[PDB]
């Protein structure tokens, strides 16, 4: 199976623990400090794995875009808060991981490795939707 065929939400949580044992996949500490289940508990994880995925998606693409994408103006230039920051981090472990490069005047895009390790998860994803959900009890 591929990205596409199965539910981004299911994907995100199965990348998200995967990458945890990606060394170079570290949280920067900055979820914890806010106030305002484990994809909150692994926040770092999901985020990454959500921009992995975004980039396999939509690659190649910038960092502005993906900030703009994920934000609650396009300003490329301007001082990064906190939102141009977790894009920022998130590609440069992704690319010390491997599994994005930067390509110039396109933006990043996913690699052959990073495409497979998002694919190879999908597949585990896949068969498992196809065995446990046709087994599930009626009533
Ligand atoms: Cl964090």
Do not use: M, N
Request: avoid cysteine.
């Amino acid at each position: 199976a591929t990205v596409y065929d199965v539910p981004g939400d299911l994907l995100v949580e199965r990348v998200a623990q995967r990458l945890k044992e990606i060394p170079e996949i570290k949280p920067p500490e900055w979820a914890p400090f806010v106030k305002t289940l484990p994809e909150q508990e692994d926040w770092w994880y999901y985020r990454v794995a959500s921009i992995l995925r975004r980039v396999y998606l939509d690659g190649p693409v910038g960092i502005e875009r993906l900030r703009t994408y994920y934000g609650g103006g396009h300003a490329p230039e301007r001082f990064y808060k906190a939102g141009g920051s977790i894009i920022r981090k998130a590609l440069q472990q992704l690319e010390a991981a491997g599994f994005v490069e930067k390509v110039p005047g396109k933006g990043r895009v996913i690699t052959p490795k990073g495409r497979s390790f998002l694919d190879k998860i999908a597949t585990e994803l896949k068969k498992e939707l196809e065995e446990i959900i046709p087994e599930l009890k009626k009533y």
